[PDB]
Every structure is written in structure tokens, then in C-alpha cells.
Design an enzyme around this catalytic site. Sequence first.
Site, PDB file in Angstrom:
ATOM      1  CB  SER B 113      -1.062  -0.120   1.118  1.00 50.59           C
ATOM      2  OG  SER B 113      -1.504   1.118   1.767  1.00 50.59           O
ATOM      3  CG  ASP B 304      -6.921  -2.937  -3.715  1.00 47.64           C
ATOM      4  OD1 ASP B 304      -7.712  -2.029  -3.348  1.00 47.64           O
ATOM      5  OD2 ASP B 304      -5.721  -2.980  -3.366  1.00 47.64           O
ATOM      6  CG  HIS B 346      -5.682  -2.355  -0.040  1.00 47.75           C
ATOM      7  ND1 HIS B 346      -4.933  -1.850  -1.084  1.00 47.75           N
ATOM      8  CD2 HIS B 346      -5.228  -1.749   1.087  1.00 47.75           C
ATOM      9  CE1 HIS B 346      -4.051  -0.987  -0.598  1.00 47.75           C
ATOM     10  NE2 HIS B 346      -4.208  -0.925   0.717  1.00 47.75           N
TER      11      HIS B 346
HETATM   12  C1  LIG Z   1      -2.306   1.720   2.757  1.00 46.41           C
HETATM   13  C2  LIG Z   1      -2.736   2.598   1.858  1.00 46.41           C
HETATM   14  C3  LIG Z   1      -3.975   2.597   0.949  1.00 46.41           C
HETATM   15  C4  LIG Z   1      -4.946   3.727   1.268  1.00 46.41           C
HETATM   16  C5  LIG Z   1      -6.047   4.029   0.261  1.00 46.41           C
HETATM   17  C6  LIG Z   1      -6.975   5.211   0.551  1.00 46.41           C
HETATM   18  C7  LIG Z   1      -7.443   5.841   1.871  1.00 46.41           C
HETATM   19  C8  LIG Z   1      -8.832   5.482   2.408  1.00 46.41           C
HETATM   20  C9  LIG Z   1      -9.360   6.190   3.656  1.00 46.41           C
HETATM   21  C10 LIG Z   1      -9.550   5.433   4.972  1.00 46.41           C
HETATM   22  C11 LIG Z   1     -10.041   6.331   6.110  1.00 46.41           C
HETATM   23  C12 LIG Z   1      -9.544   6.173   7.558  1.00 46.41           C
HETATM   24  C13 LIG Z   1     -10.538   6.465   8.683  1.00 46.41           C
HETATM   25  C14 LIG Z   1      -3.210   0.646   3.397  1.00 46.41           C
HETATM   26  C15 LIG Z   1      -2.768  -0.258   4.605  1.00 46.41           C
HETATM   27  C16 LIG Z   1      -3.933  -0.970   5.412  1.00 46.41           C
HETATM   28  C17 LIG Z   1      -3.588  -1.748   6.716  1.00 46.41           C
HETATM   29  C18 LIG Z   1      -4.592  -2.250   7.770  1.00 46.41           C
HETATM   30  O1  LIG Z   1      -5.799  -2.028   7.561  1.00 46.41           O
HETATM   31  O2  LIG Z   1      -4.224  -2.855   8.816  1.00 46.41           O
END
Ligand SMILES: */C(=C/CCCCCCCCCCC)CCCCC(=O)O
EC number: 3.1.1.3
Lengths: 382, 382
Positions: B113, B304, B346
Site C-alpha cells: 500500500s 482491490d 487490498h
Molecule cells: C495503505 C494505503 C492505501 C490507502 C487508500 C486510501 C485511503 C482510504 C481512507 C480510509 C479512512 C480512515 C478512517 C493501506 C494499509 C492498510 C492496513 C490495515 O488495515 O491494517
Amino acid sequence: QPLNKYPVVFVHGFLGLVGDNAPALYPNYWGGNKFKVIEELRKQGYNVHQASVSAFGSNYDRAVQLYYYIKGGRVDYGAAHAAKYGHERYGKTYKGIMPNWEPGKKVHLVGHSMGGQTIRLMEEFLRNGNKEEIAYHQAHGGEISPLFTGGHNNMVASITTLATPHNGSQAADKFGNTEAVRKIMFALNRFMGNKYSNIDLGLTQWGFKQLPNESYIDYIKRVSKSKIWTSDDNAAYDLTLDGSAKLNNMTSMNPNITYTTYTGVSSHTGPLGYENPDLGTFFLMDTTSRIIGHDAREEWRKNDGVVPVISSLHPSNQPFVNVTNNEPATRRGIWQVKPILQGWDHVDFIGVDFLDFKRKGSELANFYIGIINDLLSVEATE
Amino acid sequence: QPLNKYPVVFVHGFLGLVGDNAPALYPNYWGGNKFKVIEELRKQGYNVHQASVSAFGSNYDRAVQLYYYIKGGRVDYGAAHAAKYGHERYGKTYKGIMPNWEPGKKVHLVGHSMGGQTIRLMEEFLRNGNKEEIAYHQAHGGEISPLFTGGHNNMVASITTLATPHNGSQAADKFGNTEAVRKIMFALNRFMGNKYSNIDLGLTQWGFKQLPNESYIDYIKRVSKSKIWTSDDNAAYDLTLDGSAKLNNMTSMNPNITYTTYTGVSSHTGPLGYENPDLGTFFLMDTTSRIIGHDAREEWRKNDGVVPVISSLHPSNQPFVNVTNNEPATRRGIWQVKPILQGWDHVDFIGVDFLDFKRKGSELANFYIGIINDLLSVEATE
Ligand SMILES: */C(=C/CCCCCCCCCCC)CCCCC(=O)O
Ligand SMILES: */C(=C/CCCCCCCCCCC)CCCCC(=O)O
Ligand SMILES: CCCCCCCCCCCC(=O)O
Ligand SMILES: CCCCCCCCCCCC(=O)O
Ligand SMILES: CCCCCCCCCCCC(=O)O
Ligand SMILES: CCCCCCCCCCCC(=O)O
Ligand SMILES: CCCCCCCC(=O)O
Ligand SMILES: CCCCCCCC(=O)O
Ligand SMILES: CCCCCCCC(=O)O
Ligand SMILES: CCCCCCCC(=O)O
Ligand SMILES: CCCCCC(=O)O
Ligand SMILES: CCCCCC(=O)O
Ligand SMILES: CCCCCC(=O)O
Ligand SMILES: [Ca+2]
Ligand SMILES: [Ca+2]
Ligand SMILES: [Cl-]
Ligand SMILES: [Cl-]
Ligand SMILES: [Cl-]
Ligand SMILES: [Cl-]
Ligand SMILES: [Mg+2]
Ligand SMILES: [Zn+2]
Ligand SMILES: [Zn+2]
């Protein structure tokens, strides 16, 4: 005014909390976010209610509480019962949804899960009373609850059960009723009896209410003397094969009541002929499903997550007829067994499986309206 | 005597907490319960590590932190940067995983990510430095971080990205980076800065650490003066289309580095040509998936869960080549885009989707071992 002449009372199963008695964040029991059973049916002109009875107590305790939920008054479990099991005779007091309930004014009863069993026991009490309480009052005087007298008929029009373990479940025998999990359940009850608690989990008659000036330490000490820890007068025991068979052995058909059951299956046959949970079984039921589905007796394997098909279809050795989705379900005195709902797990019936996109709100709406139509038919054919 | 000559450093994305810095109950970031990436790869004789960098901060702040996580020392964001954005110049101090890291001793970098973006920026700084910091130290003297100098080559062997939003995500533009959700994120950071907190969410440079003798009231008042509330120097901004394009515009291909990307799809075409999430997409990504999948531009729809395919394949303004599963991934200086993994959302990339039974541990094991084999082959073909 209401489309239905007799009020519909929905009766939740084991673990269920409803209305004001549900925690700060907690699913809506009757319909989840998929179809708000009580609110929607009311908007459409039906008179419906959700009973509130003990989430962890026995079918006995629940059935008494159901009676008082409808009639109003102070719950009376019976002197003989209290003395036998070692809990308070008297419990909570209810306002009552129908204070004029008596022979002539009828109600439709629909039970999910254990709610199905509770409904049967309460009708048993109205019709036949409770022999041990009758004998006790003969021998010792005092007042006896009218619920225990017998001779009260023309009070229930219909009994409809959804995923009810009429014949018990192995998930009780091999998990729910083990020593380790009874202790978990009872500890939860102890905790939610603390002096800052606003929720009643349904075992206060066993002493699980901390007094305002009692320390937690003293509370622990007091309730460790309660009989609850070793009693069979609790839901865990009643949901076992033996526990459910006992209830079967003391119930009988009422020839004026329309009886109907629904059942789901959410398992599939693997190699070796065992049943495993479908994708879409609410995940908390994954292990319980495996336990049921790997039974030595083949006919006890297919299941809804926590109740095997054979337990839900009808009480074993009570009269039944397999029925179609299309025909009137208007026969009295016999269990009308509706065709199995394919892909419906135990909680799909009440709409709380927020993870399962195959089970739509519009589908659940049709399901409930279907039940009401049957109930309307029962009324029309008296 | 590790099988890999150069250490593998795995770099988590936005929201990710690892090791000692994870809460009481929290998923294991690299592999969930499905395949314990760090522990298993170590057992098989590879030298691997999980970096720990800011969960909520900018690619810039994270990239600095990544540098110090590897090299060791006190984080230095740069005087010019600190002054421009309004936060502390200096941050936490790290032991360092390779205190001898310098041109000649290389590392392999693999980013999930946002981890993927962070890795690019850091290498950019090593190779070409940071011109604003160079200019500032020219003008005002003092010390300048070696990270900002430029002229450091031969320090990173490979950059591999998994579900990295190289071209941003609409889930940021239309949700993550809105006013209301930035406030939620910042409040969480404020709270987890309280004097009883053992976890660092990565924005303490903005003032979110309560002093031992400071009241919560005073803390609220102090940190409401912080520039964080209106800054673009944060993860939410950087994950937007604009935020990601900016990073693209200031990065470049290093011709000695092996570049590879992986991408998942977990949506399907509905009747109007919009994309909706598959059953199996981790449920927390359901709405973000719909938002992406209903884009006006057709080629921005497949996704994803939180990153559209077009964003993950490669930075749009940089050279790439579509590659096969079987081709050795040993080309330098060009983004080797690996075939899309069908059904991988994702978070399936890191194994934390406990609800998805189609994505097994053994699959995830093969995927990671695959990456290591590619890295081994990078080493073998110098
Ligand atoms: C790393 C990056 C991808 C982000 C995509 C867009 C942002 C969405 C907004 C979410 C709002 C928060 C309140 C992702 C790593 C994920 C790891 C995990 O969930 O443990
Ligand atoms: C009502 C009863 C049928 C369940 C039989 C299985 C016993 C397994 C016990 C596990 C013990 C946990 C401490 C079902 C009502 C469902 C309502 C809800 O899920 O909220
Ligand atoms: C979410 C579960 C938390 C862990 C429970 C451990 C406590 C065990 C029993 C407590 C009994 C009591 O507090 O009366
Ligand atoms: C000394 C007696 C102990 C009193 C019961 C403990 C209750 C624990 C949880 C209370 C939560 C709250 O106060 O909001
Ligand atoms: C799951 C917990 C959610 C509770 C949200 C309410 C709190 C709003 C803002 C709190 C900010 C702070 O405490 O600094
Ligand atoms: C002046 C008040 C500042 C301290 C409040 C911080 C809130 C943290 C609560 C966590 C409870 C604990 O574990 O002590
Ligand atoms: C963490 C517990 C806080 C409330 C306890 C109340 C004290 C009492 O019972 O006198
Ligand atoms: C075949 C015997 C069934 C009972 C007759 C009930 C009469 C009625 O329709 O009200
Ligand atoms: C009560 C503790 C709260 C921990 C918040 C963790 C948020 C994150 O995953 O970034
Ligand atoms: C609900 C808050 C409980 C923790 C008390 C904070 C201690 C202090 O800073 O004085
Ligand atoms: C604090 C929440 C109580 C749990 C209620 C139940 O499991 O029925
Ligand atoms: C994603 C889970 C966060 C919960 C953290 C805790 O309760 O300790
Ligand atoms: C990434 C977290 C988003 C929560 C949004 C929802 O539950 O619809
Ligand atoms: Ca289901
Ligand atoms: Ca998934
Ligand atoms: Cl009566
Ligand atoms: Cl209570
Ligand atoms: Cl250096
Ligand atoms: Cl901290
Ligand atoms: Mg309450
Ligand atoms: Zn009892
Ligand atoms: Zn910064």
C-alpha cells in the site's frame, strides 16, 4: 383498527436482548438493519410486539416471564420450583402488553430459536398448569399463580417457530453446556449484575444483582454460594438433546392451535459425508457447525450453524405434515413443516448477518409478511 | 549465514502498526494468522525485517523515518521542511537495523500500500537529495542530514510494491481526505497521545504528546493550535490523486534498481458497467469499493477495495513492462508489472482478512516465497 384481530408476540431465543434491555451498541434482534420487523409491520397496520424474557435462563423461567410480559404483574416462578432449584420465587414485574388477557382474547406466538420452546411450555402451563405447584399448594396453602392452575384455553391462536431446536443441539451438548462455558456465561451474568449495570441478562433470581452498598468482593463471595453454578435450571442444559427431549415429553398438541415451523440449512456435504458450513454462515457459528456436521449419526449432520435440520423440523414423535410454500397453512393440532430454506443460517432468520449479501432486506420483508398472511388466514378460518 | 546477501525490509502502509507499537488486540500486519511473514521467512533462513514508521504521517515524514529505522539515529525531517509545515524538526530515535548502511551495502525494499510510495521517496532522497534542505543549509549553516545530501547510490537493490496507490485513490479524494474524516483521524491521534498511552500513531511531531503533569483540558487547548489541522503534510492528502501525482512528478527511475509491482482485483462489472465489490472483499472496504467502482472514467473503476487497478500497476508517468508469472523479474530501471491477482483485495496481500476462506495460508506462503525468489535472482544477476 389493526389488520390482525389477535396481537402477534415475537419471542427471541437464547442470548437475545431486545428494546430498552439491549446494550449501548448491539444488533436489533428482530430484523437487524435488513428489515425492522416491529417498526415496519406496525407501519403497515399490524399490531405486533417483541417479548423480553431471560436470555440465559431455562425454558421454565422464560415461559413464566413470557406469561407476565403479556398479562402484566410480578413474575412468580412457583414455590415448589423455587425450593427445588434454589432461586427466588419472585422476579421482575412487568407492565403487561395485554392486561385483559383471558380465555376469549387470543394472541399469535412466533418464536425464533429457543423462543420456539419457550412458547410451547407457556401454552402447556395455561392448558394443564404445573402439577408440582398444584400439589405444593394443596399440601401447604398459600396463593398459587393462575398460570399454574390449568384450565385456561382459547388464549393462543398459533405457534410458529423459526430455527427452533425442538430436539436440542449438539452445540449445546458438546460446547454450550460444558463446565468451562457455563462458567463463562455465569461470570458474564455476575458482572452484568454489578451496581452500575442497566442490562438484565436474565439470572437475577439466582442472586446476580449487586446491592448498592455491597463491595464487588462481597458480591463475588455471596453469589459463589448460589445453586446456579451446578443447576440444570438454565438455558445451556435445556438446549441439549436430553434437555429438549424432557420438554417434548411433557408437551402435547392443542387441537385449536395452528402450528407451523421453518428451518434453514447452511451446510454442504463434503468428502466422507460430513457437513461443513457454507461461506455465508455467520462466522461466529463456524465451529459449532463443524461440531454438528461431524456427528456419527448421518441424519443429525445438516444444520443452520447451531441447530441441526432434524431438530428444527418438528418435535420428534409429535404429529406433523410436510407442507408446501403455496397452500394455506391452516390445519390445527399438527406441526405444519415448511420447506427448508436453502442458504439460511440460524441468524439469517432475524436479519442480523450483516456480512451476508445474498440475504437481502426485501427477501426478509417477504418472509415476515408471509408469516403475517398465514396468521391472517388462521383468523379468517375460525 | 543468511540465504539472502541483502536484507529484506518490509514497509507497512497507512494505518499500519507493527511489533511493540501494536495495541493490546490488533492483527499481525505482515501475514495475519495466515502466514507469519517475518517469523516464517526467518525460519527458512532469510534475513528479513518489518520497518515501523508513522501510520498517519506524510510520505515525506515516513520516508525520513524509514531512513532512520534502517541506519539508526535521531529522525531529522529537515529545518526547511519543519519550518514550512510547522512541526518539530526532530523526532524519535531508532536503534538502527543496519548501522553500517552506506553505498556498497544494499537492502531490498518491499512496500504494501502506501509503504510502496514511502520507499520510492526515500530512495529519491538518497540519490538526488532534497534541494530545499541543501539551499537552507547553504544559507544558514548548521547540520544537514546525510539523507538530504544526494549522491548516495548502490544502497537499494530493489523496490517491490504490493497494492500501492502509485496514482492515488478516489477513496482518499472523496472520503479519507475530507474535512470531517481528517478531524476523526486527528482526534484519534490526540487521544493516543495521552500520558497513559504506549502506542505511537505517528503524528507526535505535530504536538500530540500530552506532558505527564498537563491536564487533558490544557492538552486539548495546546494542540488545537497545531498546524496539523490544516496541513497537506499528512497521509490523507498524499493518498489523493493530486497528492500521488506530486510524488510521481518529483521521482525518477534509478537504472540500477530492480522495480516490480503487484495488483489485486476484488470487484466485478455490474449491468451498467460499474464495478461492485466481490463477496470476499473485507467488509470494511465495501463502501470505498463502491465509490471507486462508480467513477465517471471507466478505466478508474476496477479496484482491490480501496485502490483502483490503474493506480497500483505503476506510476503513470514512469516506464513499465507487463511481465509474466514465469519471466525472471530481473530487468533494471523499469516497472515490472506482475499479472493481476484475481480475488485478492487490498488486505489479502497481508493476510489479515480473517473472514475470507478462499484466501488460504499456503497461497500467501507461496506468494511471499515467490517475492524472495525474485529477490534472490536479483542478487544472482549482478
Ligand atoms: C495503505 C494505503 C492505501 C490507502 C487508500 C486510501 C485511503 C482510504 C481512507 C480510509 C479512512 C480512515 C478512517 C493501506 C494499509 C492498510 C492496513 C490495515 O488495515 O491494517
Ligand atoms: C437460540 C437458541 C439455539 C442455539 C443452540 C446452541 C447452543 C450453543 C451455545 C454457545 C454458547 C455461547 C456462550 C439462538 C438465538 C440467536 C440470537 C443472537 O445471535 O443474538
Ligand atoms: C472481553 C472479555 C474480557 C476478559 C474476561 C476475564 C474475566 C473473567 C471473569 C470475570 C468475572 C467478574 O468480573 O465477575
Ligand atoms: C467496590 C464495588 C465495585 C463496583 C462495581 C464495578 C463496576 C465496573 C464498571 C463500572 C463502569 C462505570 O462506572 O461507568
Ligand atoms: C470507538 C470509540 C468512538 C468514540 C468517539 C467519540 C469521541 C469524539 C472525539 C474525541 C477526541 C479526544 O478524546 O481527544
Ligand atoms: C488531566 C487528565 C489527563 C489524563 C486522561 C487520559 C485518559 C486515559 C484513560 C485510560 C485509563 C487508565 O488506564 O488509567
Ligand atoms: C473501575 C471501577 C470504577 C467505579 C467503582 C465504584 C466504587 C464503589 O463501588 O464504591
Ligand atoms: C374436518 C374437521 C375440522 C374442524 C371444523 C372447524 C369448522 C370451521 O371451519 O370453523
Ligand atoms: C483503545 C486503543 C485504540 C487503538 C487505535 C489503533 C488505530 C490504528 O489501527 O491505526
Ligand atoms: C476516565 C479517566 C481515568 C484516568 C485518570 C487520569 C489521571 C490524571 O491525569 O489525573
Ligand atoms: C456487555 C455486553 C453484554 C453481552 C450480552 C449478550 O451476549 O447477550
Ligand atoms: C482494529 C482493532 C482495534 C482495537 C484495539 C483494542 O481494542 O485494543
Ligand atoms: C476504512 C474504514 C471505513 C469505514 C466505512 C464503513 O463502514 O462504511
Ligand atoms: Ca448467513
Ligand atoms: Ca478478501
Ligand atoms: Cl388467566
Ligand atoms: Cl440488572
Ligand atoms: Cl549514508
Ligand atoms: Cl506516544
Ligand atoms: Mg439499558
Ligand atoms: Zn427456575
Ligand atoms: Zn512533515
